[PDB]
Amino acid sequence: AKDFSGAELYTLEEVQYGKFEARMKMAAASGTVSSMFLYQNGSEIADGRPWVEVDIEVLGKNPGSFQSNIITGKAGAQKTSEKHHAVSPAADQAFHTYGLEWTPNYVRWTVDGQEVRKTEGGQVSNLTGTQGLRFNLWSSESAAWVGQFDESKLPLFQFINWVKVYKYTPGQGEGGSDFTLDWTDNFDTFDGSRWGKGDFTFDGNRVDLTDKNIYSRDGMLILALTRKGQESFNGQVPRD
């Protein structure tokens, strides 16, 4: 297996459309990826099925920005639309509320309630089916994308204070809006009836995502990126 340990938190259930918010302080060092994303599980299987995914990824070499993306097409022939958005304070220096909205008509990205991207059109028409909400922390082998991996910066931690998921309820949300809050997880514990911890990896990722690196402490869920064999979190959870 691999020489580093990362983590992936994922909802056990997938949904069709919705609004998803996560209050997070992201991880960043050259070479890392710290994310929030919607994912249709199995998209990675190259049997001809479609790929359905929407991303927020902080690329470690540039902590003051995040990359947005929609991945459609299919495995081995993806259609993407990478864009970048400034975040202030930098993503690894403060908590921000990251939002994703996905409806039949558009996908929208927000930071602290402010829109940073809204996409319509072809890829949106191909985000069919369901997607679960996921968060992961890893390191990409593409130095051009994330920077050379600086192992001396390990361990790194991504903190998730809370998550809110809203159902798509067109014209029936508060004040005629299109979403209605469905559930909130404040992360006082790891709720195993709601979430799973990933134990797998993929090509281009130099880490094994492992359940060893998801921690529950002081009201937050913590994802860690560590050298293999150094899986621990003995720091202080930041205040939000």
223, 7 Cβ separation under 8 angstroms: yes
Size of the site for Ca ion (CB under 5 A): 9
Coil/strand/helix, residue 62: coil
User: What sign for the dihedral angle of Cα 17, 127, 69, 194?
Assistant: positive
Which phi and psi (to 5°) does residue 36 adopt?
A: -145, 130
Q: Measured from the CB atom, is 50 or 238 closer to Ca ion? A: 238
Instruction: Please identify, among the stretches 37-45, 128-136, 182-190, 229-237, the one whose residues bind Ca ion according to the rule CB under 5 A.
Output: 182-190
Q: Measured from the CB atom, is 22 or 87 closer to Ca ion? A: 22
Q: Measured from the CB atom, is 106 or 183 closer to Ca ion? A: 183
Burial of 130 (0-12, 13-18, 19+ CB in 10 A): middle
Instruction: Please identify, among the stretches 71-79, 81-89, 102-110, 184-192, the one whose residues bind Ca ion according to the rule CB under 5 A.
Output: 184-192
Among 197, 206, 212, 217, binds Ca ion (CB under 5 A): 197
Q: How far is the CB of 149 from Ca ion (least distance, A)?
A: 4
Q: Does 219 engage in binding with Ca ion (CB under 5 A)?
A: yes
Q: Which helix (H) or strand (E) holds 5?
A: strand 4-11
Instruction: Please identify, among the stretches 10-18, 54-62, 71-79, 194-202, the one whose residues bind Ca ion according to the rule CB under 5 A.
Output: 194-202
Q: How far is the CB of 52 from Ca ion (least distance, A)?
A: 22
Tell me which amino acid residue 119 is. T
Instruction: Please identify, among the stretches 38-46, 56-64, 111-119, 205-213, the one whose residues bind Ca ion according to the rule CB under 5 A.
Output: 205-213
Q: Does 199 engage in binding with Ca ion (CB under 5 A)?
A: yes
Question: Would you call 53 a catalytic residue per the annotation?
Answer: yes
User: Which of the following is catalytic: 8, 21, 53, 101?
Assistant: 53
Question: How far apart (Å, rounded) are the C-alpha atoms in residues 227 and 219?
Answer: 25
18, 168 Cβ separation under 8 angstroms: yes
Q: How far is the CB of 199 from Ca ion (least distance, A)?
A: 4
User: What sign for the dihedral angle of Cα 11, 12, 17, 18?
Assistant: negative
Among 145, 186, 191, 212, binds Ca ion (CB under 5 A): 186
Tell me which amino acid residue 114 is. Q
Scan for tokens 């919607």, then name that residue: 38
Would you tell me which residues interact with Ca ion (CB under 5 A)?
149, 161-162, 186-187, 197, 199, 211, 219
- Known catalytic residues are 53, 57
